[PDB]
């Protein structure tokens, strides 16, 4: 078990209609994110999954949510949760990065 783990969330040029991070923004956003010396893996949630996470919580916003109103993200284990706080900062930082939760 890892503690805690950061999620990235991404502008919606980065993942649109990308099922699996296959466009070039989302490679070159995970490529940056990967050879970061504080990161041991990435995994990247696309469109679908975020609203299925997200109206399986909150199904309130089933009449008025797109299925794509949901941001995708990277899930982002670092080598130690102490790593985590300046991460984040630099994640938020980067072009095509939305939001840094965690």
Do not use: W
Not at 11 to 20: F, G, I, K, L, P
Not at 84 to 95: I, L, R, Y
Request: hydrophobic residues 35%; glycine residues 2%; contains cysteine.
């Amino acid at each position: 078990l890892d503690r805690v783990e950061s999620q990235v969330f991404l502008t919606e040029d980065v993942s649109a209609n990308d099922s699996s991070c296959d466009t070039t923004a989302c490679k070159a956003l995970r490529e940056k994110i990967e050879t970061r010396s504080d990161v041991k893996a990435v995994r990247f949630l696309n469109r679908q999954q975020a609203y299925d996470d997200a109206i399986r919580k909150f199904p309130q916003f089933k009449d008025v949510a797109g299925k794509d109103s949901f941001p995708a993200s990277f899930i982002v284990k670092l080598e130690n949760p102490e790593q985590h706080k300046d991460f984040d900062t630099a994640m938020k930082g980067q072009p095509g990065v939305l939001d840094v939760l965690n």
